[PDB]
Amino acid sequence: EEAEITKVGAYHRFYSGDKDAITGENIVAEKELDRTNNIDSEHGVATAVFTIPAAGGKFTEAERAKVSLSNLVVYVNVSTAARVTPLDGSPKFGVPADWTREHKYSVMAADGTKKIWTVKVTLNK
Numbered sequence: 001e002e003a004e005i006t007k008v009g010a011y012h013r014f015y016s017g018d019k020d021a022i023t024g025e026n027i028v029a030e031k032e033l034d035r036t037n038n039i040d041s042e043h044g045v046a047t048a049v050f051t052i053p054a055a056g057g058k059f060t061e062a063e064r065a066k067v068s069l070s071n072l073v074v075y076v077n078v079s080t081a082a083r084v085t086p087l088d089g090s091p092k093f094g095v096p097a098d099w100t101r102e103h104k105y106s107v108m109a110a111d112g113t114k115k116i117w118t119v120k121v122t123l124n125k
């Protein structure tokens, strides 16, 4: 029945300086960004403001300076049993993508009710 966005989160995904001893590949790390969310249900607008968390572990001071709105991993939480689909040129959730502009999504409820959502994300450096 419900086709809502309930949360908008983001990660900075990056190559740590560590290498796998067998494959020789650089190991990937991910850091969740701090957030504020503004969910406007009436207008189907989900807004998030991300801030860069303090340095720690492989998320060094140098890596904090690499966090970019043009290459951000965004994820959403939706209503129980709802399915979200990107519209037009919208990036997929869970993949590094350009989030400098807002993007539209179709959220489909368990009963098949569809609701168009606009996701708008900013980064405060």
Ligand SMILES: [Cl-]
Pocket (backbone or CB within 6 Å): 030, 031, 032
């Ligand atoms: Cl984290």
